[PDB]
Structure 1
Amino acid sequence: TSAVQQKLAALEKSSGGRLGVALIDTADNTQVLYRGDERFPMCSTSKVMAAAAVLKQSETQKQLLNQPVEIKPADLVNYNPIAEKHVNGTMTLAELSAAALQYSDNTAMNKLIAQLGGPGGVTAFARAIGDETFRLDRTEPTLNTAIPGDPRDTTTPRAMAQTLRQLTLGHALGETQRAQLVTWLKGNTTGAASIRAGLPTSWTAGDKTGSGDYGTTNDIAVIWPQGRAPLVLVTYFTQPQQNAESRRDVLASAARIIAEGL
């Protein structure tokens, strides 16, 4: 147990919930883990895997991101800030990827999942890039039920950090696709209260948040600190009761602990 792990344990204790953290510092490839091998519901952080899987498909279909997808009234689910504007029209796979990643549009996610054949197509991509932990089992919105002990739609902090590293900094995607993924993450609109709230303001980052039942509050980030090699940081948090409140502040606190531990 490290000093950082003890600080994270103290944060967790005061939070009422269960906290999972994985850091990869690409300066030396060292890691900080807290419940790094425990499963957590991914909620919308799973949109990164789906968008990346479609990016992978686009490596062999140069026009794929321009492919139109019909958006019908019946397609709308519980959070559709972009898709609702396009009902009875179409969105391209690029537009759907951007909407999913940058606005957490759940209808957009469902279209990405459908493009991959269903939830298992997202899991298959995870396996293809060496992630043996990630599983997507359901579509939006039921993938957010976040029931304690339920393995559906879960991963571990360790696995997600490794995957995010490979996708954004490594060779899991072609260079153009990696750059597009990073551009999308860096343009996220939903992240200022989560990991990034705990980081020095001079640092830059891209991230994808998640939220669900059981007050599940998540964020996964790639971070460029001032004067340091990039970091990959995953912070997952979930609570014992179904109607628990969101706790983005806990993720900010975890990130601050990590940052001050560098």
Structure 2
Amino acid sequence: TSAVQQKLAALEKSSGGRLGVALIDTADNTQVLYRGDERFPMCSTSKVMAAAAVLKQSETQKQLLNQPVEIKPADLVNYNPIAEKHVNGTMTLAELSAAALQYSDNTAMNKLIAQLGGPGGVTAFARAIGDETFRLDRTEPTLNTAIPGDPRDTTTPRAMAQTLRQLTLGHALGETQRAQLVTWLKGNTTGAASIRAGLPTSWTVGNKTGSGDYGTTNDIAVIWPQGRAPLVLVTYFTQPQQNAESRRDVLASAARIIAEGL
């Protein structure tokens, strides 16, 4: 009868899907895990790894984030809220990074993938920082197919929580780059209804959402409570029916339950 872990199990049961959670409380350096070693489709939470990888490149190419990149009609895919505003024009890698992270723009993600030499270049960065679980296999939008059992484009909650920590609290990146990632995450505009909706209003949050087929609804966050050691929280959720609707409420409830236990 584990404290937080039951409640999470009951939430899962109530939802009819599969929930995965990983919290890293950087006070104790304690951890709470629910299906923490199971694989989940990452969907757009993978945008953090791709942006982080371009930042890592920027450390030796100190002019890279300002490099103009052409946005061409053929580049546009299924959800391009920022990039469609610059078709037949250019956007910089900093603007593409913010577009990908703060509006979840898929054409922006693909430009980050291209800059890293394909999906294998995103996976490469993950390995370079000790993440042996993350794998990116496809570009946008097919990486969101979220097919049950499919290992493509998956990670585990434990692995992603550990990596989000190193990227945002640790030193997988250069301080200038880490601070830049933190700033990007904090001004994310998506996921008001996800993790953020389940946390005390007083806490500062940087997060990245994802969604896909099979009602896949994901959120990953680093959380600064006031007067307290920051937290890192991963909440992944996916459902048995291809036609399933999003359940952002499940992610808020998981977060609320985690925040109770603290």
TM normalised by structure 2 equals 0.99
3-state SS, counterpart of residue 37 of structure 1: coil
**Deviation sequence 1:156-195 (CA, Å, 0-9, x none):** 0000000000000001000000000000000000021000
Shift of 1:241: 1.1
Shift of 1:34: 0.1
Q: Which residue of 1 aligns with 2:234?
A: 234
**Deviation sequence 1:113-134 (CA, Å, 0-9, x none):** 0000000000000000000000
CA distance in 1, matches of 2:172, 2:21: 22
**Deviation sequence 1:66-115 (CA, Å, 0-9, x none):** 01111111111110000001000011000000000000000000000000
CA distance in 2, matches of 1:163, 1:208: 13
Shift of 1:226: 1.9
**Deviation sequence 1:180-228 (CA, Å, 0-9, x none):** 0000000000021000100000111000000000000000000001221
Size of the alignment, in residue pairs?
262
CA distance in 2, matches of 1:15, 1:126: 32
CA distance in 2, matches of 1:26, 1:209: 22
CA distance in 1, matches of 2:251, 2:162: 19
Shift of 1:243: 1.4
3-state SS, counterpart of residue 241 of structure 1: coil
Could you tell which deviates more after superposition, 220-229 or 143-152?
220-229
Shift of 1:45: 0.1
Shift of 1:229: 0.4
Shift of 1:18: 0.2
Could you tell which deviates more after superposition, 105-114 or 69-78?
69-78
Shift of 1:30: 0.5
Query: 4+ residue runs of structure 1 moved beyond 2 angstroms?
Result: none
CA distance in 2, matches of 1:226, 1:16: 34
Q: Which residue of 2 aligns with 1:216?
A: 216
CA distance in 2, matches of 1:120, 1:2: 39
Q: Which residue of 2 aligns with 1:25?
A: 25
CA distance in 2, matches of 1:253, 1:119: 32
3-state SS, counterpart of residue 13 of structure 2: helix
3-state SS, counterpart of residue 3 of structure 1: coil
Q: Which residue of 1 aligns with 2:156?
A: 156
CA distance in 1, matches of 2:149, 2:249: 24
CA distance in 2, matches of 1:194, 1:227: 23
**Deviation sequence 1:52-72 (CA, Å, 0-9, x none):** 000000000000000111111
CA distance in 2, matches of 1:130, 1:191: 28
| Aligned-residue identity in percent | 99
CA distance in 2, matches of 1:173, 1:76: 30
Equivalent residues in 2 for 1:91-240 (5 A)?
91-240=91-240
- Structure 2, gaps ≥5 residues long: none
Shift of 1:2: 1.5
Shift of 1:242: 1.0
Shift of 1:6: 0.7
3-state SS, counterpart of residue 32 of structure 1: strand
CA distance in 2, matches of 1:95, 1:2: 44
CA distance in 1, matches of 2:192, 2:225: 16
CA distance in 2, matches of 1:241, 1:53: 34
CA RMSD of aligned residues (A): 0.6
- Structure 1, gaps ≥5 residues long: none
